[PDB]
């Protein structure tokens, strides 16, 4: 049922700059632990509690601390997002860690509402955490004090959360696990508006982007909508798409759905440009732009470079036979990714 590895005449040779192993990884457990690049330094971690810091050029150890005691797994599954000399990691034991970027020591720790699966989001002096029990909390960047807490309504059957809230003009636009994308004030946590995007075939059974007063959010079933930043009213609707995560480049939208097919849409009405169904029914991660091409890693451990204007495969390379689960990172002209065993990979 899984579409086999497509045959690609490599336009160029995809290579591994450096490869550093980090802990035992996350395994077959669906987490979100992906590396984070900042000031030529790569921060990655495994679930067990091991947190490292690597050089973005060669991948050498600067510091390597563990977040476990007498060991019991720290259960890191949320992160990592790095800002302001702080490394924020969310665990499944209702904890939020803040590590200094210098030595890797704990600045502060905060007991949250539930399983912090969502990657932390840093806007203003607040750290946005979205737990599994539908509790959007904002922890103070300074000391970690829980400033406010928003109860996003819980569904019957649940998914792995999840939504990393985006922020624009006083508000934190976040998605729900029920099918509603919400917008709340950053200081009070006050509800502004709510919009429902989901269809119900009873009883048969998510990071948003703000582009010029337009909020883009995708439904858990795979319905796409453009939302007005002010009212939250739906502008246009298309019934295709899904998790994992999408990205918006200028006036085009590239995304990967439940059936793991890659396609490009227009920012205007969402019309189709091209559709790639050769990586069909594999387990691709999120797509990210790296020097003109779309980069996606599947479950077998192959990366796939795709031409953005026709959907043609540019390149294909075996990187780690352990496979790929978490999302890649393409910043500072670099390209990172973490296999299921915890090994971090720089590309080309």
């Amino acid at each position: 049922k899984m579409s086999p590895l497509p045959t690609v005449e490599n336009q160029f040779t995809p290579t591994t700059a450096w490869s550093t192993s980090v802990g035992s990884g996350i395994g077959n457990f669906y987490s979100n632990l992906h590396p984070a690049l900042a000031d030529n330094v790569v921060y990655a971690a495994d679930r067990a509690g091991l947190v490292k810091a690597l050089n973005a050029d060669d991948g050498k150890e600067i510091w390597s601390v563990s977040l476990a005691e007498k060991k019991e797994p720290a259960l890191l599954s949320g992160g990592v997002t790095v800002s302001g000399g702080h490394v924020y990691i969310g665990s499944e034991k209702a904890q939020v860690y803040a590590l200094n970027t210098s030595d890797g020591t704990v600045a502060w720790q905060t007991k949250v509402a539930g399983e912090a699966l969502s990657r932390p989001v840093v806007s203003d002096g607040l750290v946005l955490i979205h737990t599994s029990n539908g509790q959007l909390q904002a922890l103070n960047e300074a000391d970690g004090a829980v400033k406010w807490t928003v109860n996003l309504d819980m569904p019957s059957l649940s998914l792995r959360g999840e939504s990393a809230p985006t922020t624009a003009f006083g508000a934190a636009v976040v998605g729900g696990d029920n099918g509603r994308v919400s917008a709340v004030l950053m200081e009070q946590g006050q509800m502004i508006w709510q919009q429902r995007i989901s269809q119900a075939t009873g009883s048969t059974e998510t990071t948003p982007v703000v582009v010029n007063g337009v909020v883009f959010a995708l439904a858990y079933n795979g319905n796409l909508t453009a939302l007005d930043l002010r009212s939250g009213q739906i502008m246009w609707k298309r019934e295709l798409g899904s998790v994992n995560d999408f990205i918006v480049d200028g006036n085009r939208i590239y995304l990967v759905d439940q059936n793991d097919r890659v396609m490009a849409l227009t920012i205007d009405g969402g019309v189709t440009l091209w559709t790639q169904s050769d990586l069909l029914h594999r387990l691709l991660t999120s797509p990210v732009l790296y020097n003109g091409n779309l980069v996606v890693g599947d479950s077998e451990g192959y990366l796939h470079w795709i031409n953005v204007e026709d959907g043609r495969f540019v390149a294909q390379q075996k990187v780690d036979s352990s496979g790929f689960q978490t999302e890649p990172v393409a910043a500072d002209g670099k390209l990172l990714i973490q296999a299921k065993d915890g090994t971090v990979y720089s590309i080309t």
Binding site: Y30, G114, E115, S132, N133, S158, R160, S203
Partner: protein, 785 residues
């Protein structure tokens, strides 16, 4: 004026005859019909379930009816069903409305799909997608073709508890059922997923039984991965420090029983809050009022909190309700089992005043029989009465014709084969017939038993038996002899209590001995019978017919059936020969096993076992050696060989067809047998007394959700067997086999679990107090039998 129906007419009637459609019409030929009666007529033809598009309209003077019948189902072919066979898929559809020969509503095709999907959510196929394909035919027909597709299943991958600090997360998930952390192959509990359903109530009872009276479960999330093949479970809890029970106040309508309720709701202040102690008081009131004739008493408890003293005052509300009487007690679904079989397991009587608990216990006694597949209760209000009710039990019977084989393994007896066939409802009278056999390294047994559980209307049982047993002593680590035996045993079982039961009955047993190696102790019994065999021959034979009266008493107050942590088990079995038999003896066996805990959690148990056995002759004769008692092995005293504890054989100088060629023998004339010979071969005795004492400990190298499955126990086993008829004077050169002071002791470690191969039990012992001839067997196991 309209509309005078001069005539009726139909168009489109195929299967539905004219009379069948002319029947359901609320308007008929000759009537005066307007738009209100036509709308009622159309909606009436629709409620017949024969058409999908009905149309009634006027002609000049004739009321014309146009219809289009529902497509008749020609066949239902399945395609892609791997987990479910085609035959049961048929029956589940027929019990839902759709079947061959009948018709389908094309608006219910989607409901058939999602209806069959739901069956794949009963089991773990959360990705199932059954597609229905409808295809027309020459005449008004249709072939339903259900396309099945399941990519599955889901092993729930993690169970996590958030908000716990008093107890570790792994320790809490050790008590349920259903777990999923790590499904180790050791470990038996398997990790699939369905409705919990009250697995929180165990976690609820865990905190509540230890004082946390405010313990509240905020939310429970059952997570799914993007691939619909992975399940998580997250339960958020909120514990509540320490709470002492200060007092209990009773409120509500008490039905004038305030005097005795204060007793049921009394406490000794101040002691720790206990949930099951509160649940007990709730049911004690419900049972007290039930005694005073109350059908549905309702008792509720709410803990009023005192944060100042960290104590809890229990608020209890009582509502006795009303009285109800049972008119008839009916039984539906028993096409085989006669009425008396089901009605004999009741505690709510017909006519008598109603008791809700008495009805529920009626359901419990029925499924405990295991005669039925499902047992449903239904208390119906008798028409035209405020109180009289009918308690009806609906049952779907279960096939009690079972073929059951079995294999085993253990140092005590090697590989063991159990094979037979039992019918627990022949032919539906409650009787239990069964031809069962077994195979062992030193014993083969086969029987034919018939048992009536309700010989009397009170519960006394009468069981018949017809057996056949072969015994080889040389393979049982004893002095070489063979005892071929058979006979019939009838017995009565007296349930004097749910904690105690008595046994009594007669029995005939024939023992044909053969191939007995001549030795002093064995030969002494032969003289007492009146036999004089050769002390130089291996060949011999002895047929003995015996009639025996038997009595037995079994006491069991163990809390848990598998791993006892508190309680005691006592069994006493006695035998005696009634005059007229060849032998004249009596035998009394006593087995005791008591468990005593020493903590709140009952994870430190001190087990003490004792086993007593004694028997002797009556009128000059002596107790048969094939009724001797033995010790040593996996069950009696660990650290010794099987049946090696006790007397040893003193063989006579003999010569036999062996054929005396080259290898080892015992006191053989060719190997120079001039006089009596001391041996290591045990024979057991007519007097045995062993006593064990083990310290059950928590298993120390796995602190996951495991330790509550495996049980370690450091033991100190000891015992002794002797012969109260051994002439210590005539054989002064040989050890005294009549002294009970020879106590053999031992000590070691044990292991227990239920494995894929079966229930295992390891035991590494060591005999520090041993005597001459005692063969040591330190490592012992048992895989099945």
């Amino acid at each position: 004026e309209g509309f005078v129906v001069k005539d009726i007419h139909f168009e489109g009637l195929q299967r539905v005859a004219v009379g069948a459609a002319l029947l359901s019409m609320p308007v008929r030929t000759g009537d005066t019909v307007n738009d209100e009666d036509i709308s009622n007529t159309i909606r009436a033809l629709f409620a017949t379930g024969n058409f999908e598009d009905v149309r009634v309209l006027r002609d000049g003077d004739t009321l014309l009816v146009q219809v289009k019948e529902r497509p008749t189902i020609a066949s239902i072919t399945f395609s892609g069903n791997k987990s479910v066979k085609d035959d049961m898929l048929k029956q589940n559809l027929e019990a839902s409305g759709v079947r061959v020969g009948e018709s389908l509503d094309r608006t219910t095709i989607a409901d058939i799909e999602k209806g069959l999907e739901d069956f794949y959510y009963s089991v773990g196929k959360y990705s199932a997608s059954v597609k229905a394909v409808v295809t027309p035919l020459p005449r008004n027909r249709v072939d339903l073709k259900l396309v099945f597709q399941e990519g599955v299943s889901a092993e729930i991958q993690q169970i996590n508890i958030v908000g716990n600090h008093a107890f570790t997360t792994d320790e809490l998930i050790s008590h349920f059922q259903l777990r999923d952390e790590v499904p180790w192959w050791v470990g038996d509990r398997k990790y699939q997923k369905q409705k919990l359903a009250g697995d929180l109530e165990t976690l609820r009872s865990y905190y509540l039984d230890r004082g946390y009276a405010r313990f509240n479960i905020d939310s429970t999330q059952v997570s799914l991965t993007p691939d619909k093949k992975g399940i998580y479970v997250t339960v958020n809890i909120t514990e509540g420090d320490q709470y002492k029970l200060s007092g209990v106040e009773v409120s509500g309508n008490l039905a004038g029983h305030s005097a005795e309720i204060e007793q049921l709701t009394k406490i000794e202040p101040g002691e720790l809050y206990n949930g099951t102690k509160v649940t007990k008081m709730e049911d004690d009131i419900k049972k007290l009022l039930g005694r005073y004739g109350y059908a549905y008493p309702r008792v509720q408890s709410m803990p009023e909190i005192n944060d100042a003293d960290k104590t809890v005052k229990l608020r209890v509300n009582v509502d006795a309700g009303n009285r109800f009487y049972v008119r008839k007690i009916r039984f539906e679904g028993n096409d085989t089992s006669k009425d008396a079989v089901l009605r004999r397991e009741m505690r709510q009587m017909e006519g008598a005043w109603l008791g809700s608990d008495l009805v529920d216990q009626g359901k419990e006694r029925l499924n405990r029989l295991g005669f039925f597949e499902t047992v449903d209760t239904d208390t119906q209000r008798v028409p035209g009465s405020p109180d009289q009710v009918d308690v009806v039990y609906k049952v779907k019977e279960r096939n009690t014709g079972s073929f059951n084989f079995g294999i085993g393994y253990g140092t005590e007896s090697g590989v063991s084969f159990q094979a037979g066939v039992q019918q627990d409802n022949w032919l539906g009278t409650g009787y239990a017939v069964g031809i069962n056999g077994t195979k062992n390294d030193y014993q083969t047994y086969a029987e034919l038993s018939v048992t009536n559980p309700y010989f009397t209307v009170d519960g006394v049982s009468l069981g018949g038996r017809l057996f056949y047993n072969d015994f080889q002593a040389d393979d049982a680590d004893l002095s070489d002899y063979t005892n071929k035996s058979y006979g019939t045993d009838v017995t009565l079982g007296f349930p004097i209590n749910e904690y105690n039961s008595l046994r009594a009955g007669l029995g005939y047993v024939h023992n044909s001995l053969s191939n007995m190696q001549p030795q002093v102790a064995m030969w002494r019994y032969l003289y007492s019978m009146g036999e004089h065999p050769s002390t130089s021959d291996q060949d011999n034979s002895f047929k003995t017919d015996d009639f025996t009266f038997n009595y037995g008493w079994t006491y069991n107050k163990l809390d848990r059936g598998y791993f006892p942590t508190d309680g005691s088990r006592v069994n006493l079995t006695g035998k005696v020969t009634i005059p007229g038999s060849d032998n004249e003896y009596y035998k009394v066996t006593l087995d005791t096993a008591t468990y005593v805990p020493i903590d709140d959690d009952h994870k430190w148990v001190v087990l003490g076992r004792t086993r007593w056995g004694y028997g002797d002759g009556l009128g000059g004769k002596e107790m048969p050696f094939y009724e001797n008692f033995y010790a040593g092995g996996s069950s009696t005293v660990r650290g010794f060989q099987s049946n090696t504890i006790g007397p040893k054989a003193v063989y006579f100088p003999h010569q036999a067809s062996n054929y005396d060629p080259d290898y080892d023998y015992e006191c053989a004339t060719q190997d120079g047998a001039k006089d009596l010979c001391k041996s290591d071969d045990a024979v057991g005795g007519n007097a045995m007394a062993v006593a064990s004492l083990e310290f059950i400990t928590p298993t120390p190298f796995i602190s996951d959700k495991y330790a509550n499955s495996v049980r370690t126990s450091f033991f100190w086993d000891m015992g002794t067997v002797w012969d109260t008829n051994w002439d210590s004077s005539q054989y002064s050169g040989y050890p005294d086999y009549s002294d009970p002071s020879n106590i053999r002791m031992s000590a070691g470690i044990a292991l227990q679990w239920m494995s894929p191969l079966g229930p295992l039990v390891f035991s590494y012992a060591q005999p520090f107090k041993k005597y001459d001839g005692d063969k040591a067997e330190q490592f012992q196991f048992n895989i099945g039998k």
